[PDB]
Amino acid sequence: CEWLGRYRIITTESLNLLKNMGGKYADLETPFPSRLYTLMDKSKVEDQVKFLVLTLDHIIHLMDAREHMNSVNWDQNTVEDFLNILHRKSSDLKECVARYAKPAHKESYEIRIKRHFRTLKKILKKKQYSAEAWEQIRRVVKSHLQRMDIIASNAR
Ligand code: NI
């Protein structure tokens, strides 16, 4: 997959937007599927890329929530840029994924990663999309971006 090239660039720029859209990061006090990422770290390349597309798309979907962000002072244009940077890389990777054999059973990584993002959305709702609920989500997304970059490195 050609599109795993220069991925560090996506990582750097996206983490930059994530950092600049708001205040300093909150402490990580929310669940994160490190278990899953460990598994992905040593999975085959086809699975790694499929996993990157799945996760990118989940992050885009989570963050595309201007209608629920009154409680944060984040710069919305920076949010939009964040969405866009990740959507473009994701759309490139989807090209490689189209080439892969679409397998026997739903992969456990797709199930688990969805399950995690579900949890995050649930948390935001329970907390009525408060500033600290959003700041947890933001801190969590930082962690995904850091681990995704490792997977991309190892994948290439
Ligand atoms: Ni989603």
Burial of 69 (0-12, 13-18, 19+ CB in 10 A): middle
Q: Which amino acid is at 53?
A: V
- d(CA 62, ligand 1 centre) in Å: 7
- d(CA 21, ligand 1 centre) in Å: 22
At a CB cut-off of 8 Å and minimum separation 6, what does 62 contact? Answer: 117, 120, 121, 137, 141
At a CB cut-off of 8 Å and minimum separation 6, what does 88 contact? Answer: none
- d(CA 115, ligand 1 centre) in Å: 10
Write the CATH number for 150: 1.20.1250.10
Q: How many structural domains compose the chain?
A: 1
What gap in Å lies between CA 108 and CA 51, rounded to an integer? 10
SS3 content of the chain, % helix, strand, coil (to 5): 75, 0, 25
- d(CA 99, ligand 1 centre) in Å: 22
Exp. method: X-ray
- d(CA 58, ligand 1 centre) in Å: 4
Give residue 156's domain range: 1-156
